[PDB]
DNA sequence: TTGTGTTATTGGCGTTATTAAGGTAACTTGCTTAT
């Protein structure tokens, strides 16, 4: 369903969207917070139990 | 004023440098481009 939103009128596949999503937020060379987003989120939530 | 000397051009010629056309047979198979 997400893959429809991102690419409308694009017939989905089996082993394609599995790359799309996990590359949308979960690729170290595609998305980052660079020591600041991490700290400003941790302190905002307290959860040191996530690696800063 | 009429003779003998240029000339300026102007279609023909060739010459060739430049442009266009075509052909290889080891196997090769679906981005998305990012306030």
Curated annotation (Swiss-Prot):
DNA-dependent RNA polymerase catalyzes the transcription of DNA into RNA using the four ribonucleoside triphosphates as substrates. This is DNA-directed RNA polymerase subunit beta. Belongs to the RNA polymerase beta chain family. The RNAP catalytic core consists of 2 alpha, 1 beta, 1 beta' and 1 omega subunit. When a sigma factor is associated with the core the holoenzyme is formed, which can initiate transcription. The chain holds residues 367 to 418 of 1358 of the full protein.
């Amino acid at each position: 369903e997400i893959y429809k939103v991102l690419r409308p009128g694009d017939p989905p596949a089996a082993a394609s969207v599995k790359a799309l999503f996990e590359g949308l937020f979960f690729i170290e060379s595609r998305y980052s917070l660079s020591d600041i987003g991490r700290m400003k989120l941790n302190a905002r939530l307290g959860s040191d139990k996530v690696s800063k």
